[PDB]
Structure 1
Amino acid sequence: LHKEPATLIKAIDGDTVKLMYKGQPMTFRLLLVDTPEFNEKYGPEASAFTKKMVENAKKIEVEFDKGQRTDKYGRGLAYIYADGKMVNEALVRQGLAKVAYVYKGNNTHEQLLRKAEAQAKKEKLNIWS
């Protein structure tokens, strides 16, 4: 996989963020994770976490996987990085996302994220508390 440049437009929630990519505004849905909705428990925490990460980053990068790049809602599907650190993995490691939505064609970092989830779960973090 390869990392591509993008710029933050707006934080949205734990697992969606609005970026400018190849010069076009686009909502991105984070691959392989599921954060609680803002109205659910840990939803506010997940939004705050992703917000700080993308807002504090001097460099945002988008990394598509091998399958479809857009979902049925028009959202881009990618791994998102903030100064080199993967937001998707970071949310899981903190127990603010579950590994989820593992689809056949777009699963490259699956075992990486499950390792992070095992450690968050081991540590009883947030969702796992």
Structure 2
Amino acid sequence: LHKEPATLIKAIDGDTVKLMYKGQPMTFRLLLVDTPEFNEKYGPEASAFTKKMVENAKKIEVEFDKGQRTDKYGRGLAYIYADGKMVNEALVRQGLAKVAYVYKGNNTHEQLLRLAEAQAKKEKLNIWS
């Protein structure tokens, strides 16, 4: 897997962001995580966390996994990094997303994220409180 540069256009919610990738605006959906919808508990906090992380970053990178690269809605499926820190991981570690979906061959970081989720759950953080 390799990191590719991208530019933030707009943070949408906890697990969806809009980036300039290959000269076009593209929606990206974070691999292996599920934040609550903004209309649900911790949804607004999950939105806020992702927004700050990506808006404050000097460098955004996208890393596609080895499986399918877009969902049925045209959204890129990637791990996103802000100054080398994975947003997917940071959200799970903060108890603001659950580990989820896990399919179409995109599981490279599954263990890393499950380890993060267990620690958030052990700390009874946010979603787990």
Do both proteins adopt the same fold according to a TM-score greater than 0.5, normalized to the shorter chain?
A: yes
Deviations 1:5-52 (A, max 9, x none): 000000100000000011110000000000000000000000000000
Give the 3-state SS of the residue equivalent to 1:28 in structure 2: strand
How far the C-alpha of 1:2 sits from its partner, in A, is 0.4
| Contiguous gaps of at least 5 residues in structure 2 | none
Deviations 1:64-123 (A, max 9, x none): 000111000000000000000000000000000000001141000000000000000000
**For the Cα contact (< 8 Å) 2:67–2:105, is it kept in 1?**
yes
Point out 4+ residue stretches in structure 1 off by more than 6 angstroms. none
**For the Cα contact (< 8 Å) 2:68–2:104, is it kept in 1?**
no
For 2:127 and 2:40, the matched residues in 1 are separated by: 11
Is 2:15 the partner of 1:9?
A: no
For 1:23 and 1:14, the matched residues in 2 are separated by: 24
TM-score calculated relative to the size of structure 2: 0.99
TM-score calculated relative to the size of structure 1: 0.99
Give the 3-state SS of the residue equivalent to 2:12 in structure 1: strand
Structural RMSD (CA): 0.5
Identity of matched residues, %: 99
| Contiguous gaps of at least 5 residues in structure 1 | none
Partner of 1:114: 114
Partner of 2:78: 78
Stretch deviating more after TM superposition (77-86 or 103-112): 103-112
For 1:58 and 1:67, the matched residues in 2 are separated by: 28
For 1:115 and 1:39, the matched residues in 2 are separated by: 27
